[PDB]
Design a protein around this nucleic acid. Structure first.
Lengths: 77, 149
RNA sequence: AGCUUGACUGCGAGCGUGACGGCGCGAGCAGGUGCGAAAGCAGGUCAUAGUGAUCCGGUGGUUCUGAAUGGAAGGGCCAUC
RNA sequence: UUGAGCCUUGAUGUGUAGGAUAGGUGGGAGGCUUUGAAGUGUGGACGCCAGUCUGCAUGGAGCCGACCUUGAAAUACCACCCUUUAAUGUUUGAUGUUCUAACGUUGACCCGUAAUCCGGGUUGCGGACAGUGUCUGGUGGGUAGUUUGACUGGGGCGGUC
RNA sequence: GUUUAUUAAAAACACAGCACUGUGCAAACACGAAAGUGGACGUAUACGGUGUGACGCCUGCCCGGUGCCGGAAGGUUAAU
RNA sequence: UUUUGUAUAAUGGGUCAGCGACUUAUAUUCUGUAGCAAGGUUAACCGAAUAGGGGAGCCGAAGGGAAACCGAGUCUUAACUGGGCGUUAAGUUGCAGGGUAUAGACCCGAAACCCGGUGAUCUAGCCAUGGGCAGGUUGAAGGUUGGGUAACACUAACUGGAGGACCGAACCGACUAAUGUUGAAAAAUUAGCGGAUGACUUGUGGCUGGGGGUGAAAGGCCAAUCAAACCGGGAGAUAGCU
RNA sequence: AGGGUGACAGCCCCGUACACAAAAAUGCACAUGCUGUGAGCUCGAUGAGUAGGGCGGGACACGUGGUAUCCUGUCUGAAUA
RNA sequence: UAAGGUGAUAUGAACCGUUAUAACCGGCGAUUUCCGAAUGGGGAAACCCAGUGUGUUUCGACACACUAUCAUUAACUGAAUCCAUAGGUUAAUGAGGCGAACCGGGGGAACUGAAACAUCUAAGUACCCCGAGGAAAAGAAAUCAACCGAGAUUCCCCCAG
């Protein structure tokens, strides 16, 4: 399902409002992309379905810490 | 992105410094191909540490050793009496080979490769000077009186 | 035809007229004005049509309010679109 | 390949009084010259074509401040600068070509594997495109929710409010 | 041939044939939040949509309106 | 019962017996009544627990003004001979009642909308795998042998067995008439009628599902239901109408 | 209290008030054994793609309104006693 | 505890018991076919078909036990590739399903009311889904208040329609 594997971003729900304020249901989707991350400590490419701010937090925290979190909460990579 | 280089990298590289780069360039190219690592605190202190120290140590050691060499023999004089004839023009001319081991017996242990010869094969009986290249800038000048036996 | 701004501002005894919202007539009181020598007359036009509630909002004035306090924003009130 | 900003630095700027293609301000009267002078041959930069500037050199070692007609003094020295421009370095954007490294592959081969799924590996092709997310204009009876007045000698039509 | 099972069997629907139009394959198109699947283990002599409806003789004029296709100069024009 | 007006030939009721429609809760207002009275009264809760505590609060004794503010006055206005609203009369808490408000709100009654499921044993299409079509006609292509040609073409006899071909039973259908119409039957019977080797028909299994399927298209069919199935729920929808 | 008994029972029966009862298994509450766990003192640290922001939406009684605050799909992004 | 019993329709027959091993009541045990999460594979539920191991003095046939998937952990193996990861096998522990309401979370209508209707209402209701407990949730101030102070969360009566 469309869940970011790092930040855990589900699709949420909402409304299309219009100029007449007619409420309609919609879904906001995360910016999920399937990117292939080089880990130096393991010398491998681990491919993840991250958001486009799961890549921000991988750029900041580092890929090793993130993989330690996914292994910590049982998310299989 | 603030990667720390590990290479000559074409238009921004200086072998271990700090550059601001786009993120795609960092994680897709620089980081997996070696070439860079992101500046995340401890490492930037540590990587710098040895490198900065390195510069201080090599330079100082070299300068000191060379100044010491320049200083060596306190007499600053090497004399030689080679076979010759009557009124100048000696029999066999000395060279840089002969003096290199002659100075070893009376002081400085400088080899053939560091003595500059403006007089050539030194075919004259009189006052001569062998300026040593103990260092690229430091000159060790020892006076020499050649005796015509 | 001459001079003019009463096509004033705050009120208003009393009435008429409507289910109400509302609409109309009004002598007189105060302030300031015009015309007239003066008595006086003038709060639009001989009268009866020429129109649109509330909300929402715009503009000018007034500290009346102004969520700790001093301001301000917003609101109110008066004029008005 | 194409613009701006900035630094250094070199130029740049004729009512008219008038020898002066001088903007202001301003401390000051010596700068200047043989770390090889005025004047001139000559080309160029510049031009409101009025008259500056100026590489090399014959020449060869002087040129000029308050003075004077001016609103002003003499870029002879200098400082800070407005307009306008010249070279460099540097700071960033734009466009086109080229590249391999993200991504796509419903190309080939190998492995999990006695498997036309899938995943991993090698390679080929495409490649910052495509594709997807949020935002946004357009289109949108494909679909949905609805509206479509009253009087009225029945209703409609006409008329009216 | 088909159709209103249960008041309509027909001139209606279909049809072979014709034309227009889309589609270069990961095809258009359709079902599907997606994966995928049909199209098709097909490849433009194929496939989808639309109209007309064997065959014969034919199919005239109009591009102002609505649509579609094409163009990029100028006007207007969102997020930013 | 509804009506201007019903013996009305307008509605309803075959009869009996049983059930069947103005309720309940909480707020607010007025009337009656009871307590206390410029005061009345507690709520939650504690609880020897319908007692007693608990006065948090509410209502009243003061209004005017948009408000600051003022106060038996206040607002308007520069100010009122003035004018508006007040002053000059008891309230409050129970209990009973009449209204009102919010809830299904006196009872019964829609067509419909939405949400979740069950249905392709009927029928519509499709997929797979098996069956069926008595009997009789017609006589295409092709072929063989003669004729014919330079060789073809063409031509005659014999053969051959094509076809959404012909006639006609089973089989599928349903054109007409009559009967039937509280049927024998919630669609048939009887007498004729169309197709009957095909775009046929049939058995067994499978697949498609509700704004969805399927449709040689009729708005047909989807379990005797179809301009949006059935079941359950929202749900006592709503009903200015009977 | 109640129920039954051939009609209506304090004294007919079962019961009720009251007083007692558990070999065994258990719930709760104390006490206690062991295991695990850690008290307390000094000093240091004191939660970053986060708070906040732009766009879209939602929750707050509050419908974007002058709208604080919270939540976040998207793009960004601090200070750190 | 006991003088009466072998449940009812429901009588019989055949018996058991009377001072304690009849019956009845309770605690703890034993047995507990087949289906059903169903768990060895399958299936049209209550049926069909196995494999592996242990044992069976007529071992030519029987009896017993184990064999589901997933998650976690460990051991032994193990590709493309060298190391290694993926994968494979075995073992240990746990889970799976049902249940009326209450609770938290993910989604989420419309009829209705507005005397039409679209913002709004109904209503975060009905319903669907996930999860948990005997309760859940929340909770120990980046909270109010207001120049005085209060001191986590939850529930009730006011505030106050």
């Amino acid at each position: 399902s469309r869940v970011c594997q790092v930040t855990g971003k589900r699709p949420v729900t909402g409304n299309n409002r219009s100029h007449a304020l007619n409420a309609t249901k919609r879904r906001f989707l995360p910016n999920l992309h399937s990117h292939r991350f080089w880990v130096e400590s393991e010398k491998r490419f681990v491919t993840l379905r991250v958001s486009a701010k799961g890549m921000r937090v991988i750029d900041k925290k580092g890929i090793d810490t993130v993989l330690a979190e996914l292994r910590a909460r049982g998310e299989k990579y | 992105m603030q990667v720390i280089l590990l290479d000559k990298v074409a238009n921004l590289g200086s072998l271990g410094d700090q550059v601001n780069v786009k993120a795609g360039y960092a994680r897709n190219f620089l980081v997996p191909q070696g070439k860079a690592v992101p500046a995340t605190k401890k490492n930037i202190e540590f990587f710098e540490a040895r490198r900065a120290e390195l510069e201080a140590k090599l330079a100082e050691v070299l300068a000191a050793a060379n100044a010491r060499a320049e200083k060596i023999n306190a007499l600053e004089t090497v004399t030689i009496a080679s076979k010759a004839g009557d009124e100048g023009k000696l029999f066999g001319s000395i060279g840089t080979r002969d003096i290199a081991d002659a100075v070893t017996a009376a002081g400085v242990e400088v080899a053939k490769s560091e003595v500059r010869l403006p007089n050539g094969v030194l075919r004259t009986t009189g006052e001569h000077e062998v300026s040593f290249q103990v260092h690229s800038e430091v000159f060790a000048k020892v006076i020499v009186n050649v005796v015509a036996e």
